[PDB]
Amino acid sequence: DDVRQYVVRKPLNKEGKKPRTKAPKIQRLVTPRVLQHKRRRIALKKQRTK
RNA sequence: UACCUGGUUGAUCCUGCCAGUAGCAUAUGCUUGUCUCAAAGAUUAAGCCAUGCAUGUCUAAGUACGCACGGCCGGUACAGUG
């Protein structure tokens, strides 16, 4: 199930500006970038043994 | 430039120290147009201190839901500045 689906969103309704909603940056979220970093670390191990 | 002048005796020479003389430091006095460098609360009290300042710091790369601002496109977690 998707954690990013269920984020607690915060409204923002101040006069003189457009009413908008903010959401936080989710931490400890698996993304392609952390997986790419993991692959890079294992690659560094590979070249060191070679 | 390895230089001298004077002072004891009625007069001569000498030992001898002193005064003058030149440099360096500090202080001070009088005077003082221009320009270039430039020391400067050590000496006496490592005495005592009013007030202000003398040490802070962010990149693409630790943490951003402060609308403090700010475009989306709209379920697009997080634009970006901060």
UniProtKB/Swiss-Prot annotation:
Highest taxon of the lineage: Eukaryota
Subcellular location: Cytoplasm; Nucleus, Nucleolus
Post-translational modifications: Ribosomal protein S6 is the major substrate of protein kinases in eukaryote ribosomes. The phosphorylation is stimulated by growth factors, tumor promoting agents, and mitogens. It is dephosphorylated at growth arrest.
Biological function: Component of the 40S small ribosomal subunit. Plays an important role in controlling cell growth and proliferation through the selective translation of particular classes of mRNA. Part of the small subunit (SSU) processome, first precursor of the small eukaryotic ribosomal subunit.
Quaternary data: Component of the small ribosomal subunit. Part of the small subunit (SSU) processome, composed of more than 70 proteins and the RNA chaperone small nucleolar RNA (snoRNA) U3.
Family assignment from sequence similarity: Belongs to the eukaryotic ribosomal protein eS6 family.
Protein name, as recorded: Small ribosomal subunit protein eS6
Residues of the full protein shown: 151 to 200 of 249
